[PDB]
Subunit: 101 residues, 2 copies
């Protein structure tokens, strides 16, 4: 599942939104964006799938490398930790558009 | 929070996917989509935030007005009931991309 980074380039993250330019199935490419806040949660400071609204607990989001979302997130106790998640786990390039799967 | 309908137009709902054309922060427009199935649940026939996968229990999804999602969802007892939820509560436009917050 996922693996968008293998067929996309010029990816960027601003806030909770990922943008990238991806290869289409029958040739050519397309630029699209997807909000990651709908599909990533913060759980005691760690980014996890199967949830939403990590941005309520996190700040300074960045794209590290070709597919990692990095951020500083608030733990249950209230202090922050550095955390990351590999977007290639579930963000795919479906015919030129970024999708969660 | 939310209020995407104030800066977007030509919105449409297909299944659980909302598509709309939104103005970017400094001008210009972008058409994007967000899969509402990631952020809306259906509990005993009623659509609600703070959950996911409402489409598993619902049919006949439609956009009502500029910002409401309407559908028919299955109650625990078995029968379907009409239900609606206002997407403007938690779907926003950030620089041309639909986002959950």
């Amino acid at each position: 599942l996922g693996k968008f980074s293998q067929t996309c380039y010029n990816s960027a993250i601003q806030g909770s939104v990922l943008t990238s330019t991806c290869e289409r199935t029958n040739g050519g490419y397309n630029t699209s964006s997807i909000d990651l806040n709908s599909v990533i949660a913060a759980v005691d400071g760690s980014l996890k799938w199967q949830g939403s609204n990590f941005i309520e607990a996190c700040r300074n989001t960045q794209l590290a490398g070709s597919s990692e979302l990095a951020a500083e997130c608030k733990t249950a106790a209230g202090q922050f930790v550095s955390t990351k998640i590999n977007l290639d786990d579930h963000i795919a390039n479906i015919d030129g558009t970024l999708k969660y799967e």
